[PDB]
Amino acid sequence: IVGGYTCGANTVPYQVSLNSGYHFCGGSLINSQWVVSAAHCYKSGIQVRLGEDNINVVEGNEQFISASKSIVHPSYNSNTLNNDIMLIKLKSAASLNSRVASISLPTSCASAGTQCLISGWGNTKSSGTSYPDVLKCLKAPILSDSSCKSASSYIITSNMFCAGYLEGGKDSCQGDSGGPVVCSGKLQGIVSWGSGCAQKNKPGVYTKVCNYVSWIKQTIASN
Numbered sequence: 001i002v003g004g005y006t007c008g009a010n011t012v013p014y015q016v017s018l019n020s021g022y023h024f025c026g027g028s029l030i031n032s033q034w035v036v037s038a039a040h041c042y043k044s045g046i047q048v049r050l051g052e053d054n055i056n057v058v059e060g061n062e063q064f065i066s067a068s069k070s071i072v073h074p075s076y077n078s079n080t081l082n083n084d085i086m087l088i089k090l091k092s093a094a095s096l097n098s099r100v101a102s103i104s105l106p107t108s109c110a111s112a113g114t115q116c117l118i119s120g121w122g123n124t125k126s127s128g129t130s131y132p133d134v135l136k137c138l139k140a141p142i143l144s145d146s147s148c149k150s151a152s153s154y155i156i157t158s159n160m161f162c163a164g165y166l167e168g169g170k171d172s173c174q175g176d177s178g179g180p181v182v183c184s185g186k187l188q189g190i191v192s193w194g195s196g197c198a199q200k201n202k203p204g205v206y207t208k209v210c211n212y213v214s215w216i217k218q219t220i221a222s223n
């Protein structure tokens with residue numbers, strides 16, 4: 001997260017860290033047995049880390065659970081990143097509490113202008129490299145497709161939406177991928193991609209979760 005602020009220990013209870021010997025992507029807890037993340041974050045040997053704040057110090061509220069199954073979206077395209085979403089099932093159900101909670105799936109999509117909360121342990125520098133150990137937060141609005149495409153020349157599909165500030169300075173970044181974009185209490189986005197970080201006229205691109213609720217619900221019911 002570039003230009004954000006220290007969230008505060010466990011203030012984003014649904015945020016998870018995907019670990020394969022080190023943190024490599026974020027994710028969202030949607031229930032006691034399932035996590036949603038980005039398809040390009042797929043890797044084998046994933047261990048889900050819940051209740052985290054400082055990812056380098058055991059603080060006492062963490063729950064480390066291995067993934068028993070990973071399901072990348074059937075139409076995921078790594079070339080354009082269309083349908084960049086994936087579900088991960090935990091080997092054992094997580095214990096829900098004040099510091100480990102699930103986030104609700106959307107009933108309908110969100111309109112441009114809506115404010116959202118984006119969080120992650122990604123790079124905090126715009127022109128350099130610096131990774132935080134504590135979770136960083138960032139409030140940003142949903143931009144209209146027209147203003148996004150016009151300003152960035154990005155090739156965006158109906159399964160993506162842009163969020164951020166065209167003036168740059170604030171944006172998600174490397175290491176934040178797979179993380180949540182929560183607006184009005186619902187999980188509306190998954191950090192997907194972008195061009196550099198916090199660049200002028202280059203806002204972040206997110207997976208439009210409202211378009212996948214049926215697939216998500218169906219997949220968890222049958223798995």
Ligand SMILES: COC(=O)[C@H](Cc1cccc(C(=N)N)c1)NC(=O)CNS(=O)(=O)c1ccc(C)cc1
Nearest residue numbers: 079080171172173174192193194195196197204205
């Ligand atoms: C540009 O260089 C990168 O390393 C970015 C970082 C990044 C990741 C997530 C969000 C942001 C952001 N600014 N909000 C930035 N990664 C990527 O963007 C993802 N991998 S990528 O750079 O390989 C890529 C990008 C776009 C397509 C169609 C295909 C592949």
Ligand SMILES: [Ca+2]
Nearest residue numbers: 054057058059
């Ligand atoms: Ca920790």
